[PDB]
Amino acid sequence: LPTSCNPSDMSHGYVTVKPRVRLHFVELGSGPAVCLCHGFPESWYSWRYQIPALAQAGYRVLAMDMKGYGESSAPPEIEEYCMEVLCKEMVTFLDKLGLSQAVFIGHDWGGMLVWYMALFYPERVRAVASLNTPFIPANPNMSPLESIKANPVFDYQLYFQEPGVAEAELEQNLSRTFKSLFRASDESVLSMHKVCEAGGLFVNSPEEPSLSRMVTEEEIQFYVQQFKKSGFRGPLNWYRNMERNWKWACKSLGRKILIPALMVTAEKDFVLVPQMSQHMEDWIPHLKRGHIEDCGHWTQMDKPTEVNQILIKWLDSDARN
Ligand SMILES: CCS(=O)(=O)n1ccc2cc(C(=O)NCc3ccc(NS(=O)(=O)C4CC4)cc3C(F)(F)F)ccc21
C-alpha cells in the first residue's frame, strides 16, 4: 500500500469564502497547486493514499473537505449545494489563497464539480482530472427527471430527494453506514434497485457488516467522527439540485473545454459506468484517458497504486510546463 496520512500530522488550512462558509483543507508538498475534491459521502481523507505520493512527485497538494463535510461549513439550505454556488466558492477559495490557477482532480460529486470548474472557469484551472464521473453536456430540451427515472441503478437517488428521510437512515448508526458503503464491488451488500420500495438503503443489509478488505476499523472510525460534526444533510443536498444544476449547465452554450483533461474510468463502478464517458472527446479536444481494472466506486482506496501512477504520469506530462 502507498504511504497514507495521519490527520494529526497534517497542515490544516481554513479559508472563509463568505461570512458563514469556511472551507477546510489539508496541505502537503511544494510545486504546482493540485486541489483534490472528494465525493459523497467522503472526506479529504479519501485521498489519504494520493496526498503523499503527489507531494513526493513534486506537487503542492490541497485536499478539501467539500462544503457540507468534516471541518467545512455545512449550512442546511439545499440551494447552498448547487454547482453554481459550489464552483463560485472554489474560485473565491483560490482568490483568498492567492492562487492564479490550480489543477483540479475530483471523484464522484467532486468530479462533477471539477468538470464545471473547467467548463465555466478555465482561466483558473490549469488542468482537470475526474475519477469515475463523466462530463455529459446538458441537453437544453430535456428534463433531469426523465434521465435518472430511466436507469434503474439511479433509484436510490430518488430516495435521497426528500429532506430528512435518508438522513435518518444514514445517521442511525454511523459505523454501520460506512462499513456498508465502503466495500469492493464483489463485497457489496446493497442493491441500488427499488430502494424506495424497500424503504431504505440498508433495510436488507447486515446489522453488523463485516469490514471490507479495503479499509481498517480505525479508518472507518475516522469517517464516523467526521460525520458526527454535521451529519448527512449537507452531503445529501448535493443530490437535491438537479434542475438548478441543469439550468446553469445549459448556459455553457456550445462551448468546449479546451484545457488539458483526464478521464479515469473504473471497470466495476456499476453506477458511474465507463460507457457513460463515451464520446467525451467531442466536447474536450485535449482529453486523455486512464482505465482501472478490478476497481469499484471507491477508486482511491480500491486501487491506490494505480490511481497514483495514472495521475502522476498525466500531471508530469500535461500539468507541469
Ligand atoms: C452523469 C453524472 S451523474 O450520474 O449525475 N453523477 C455525478 C456524480 C454522481 C454521484 C452519484 C452517487 O450516487 N455517488 C455515490 C455512490 C456511487 C456509487 C455507489 N455504489 S455502486 O453500487 O455503484 C458500486 C460500484 C459498484 C454508491 C454510492 C453511494 F451513494 F452509496 F455513496 C450518482 C450520480 C452521479
Residue numbers in the entry: 228 to 548
What's written in the study?
Soluble epoxide hydrolase (sEH) is a ubiquitously expressed bifunctional enzyme encoded by the gene EPHX2. The protein harbors two distinct catalytic domains connected by a proline-rich linker. The bifunctional soluble epoxide hydrolase (sEH) represents a promising target for inflammation-related diseases. Proteolysis targeting chimeras (PROTACs) are heterobifunctional molecules that induce the ubiquitinylation and subsequent proteasomal degradation of a protein of interest (POI) by bringing the POI into close proximity with an E3 ligase, such as cereblon (CRBN) or the Von-Hippel-Lindau E3 ligase.
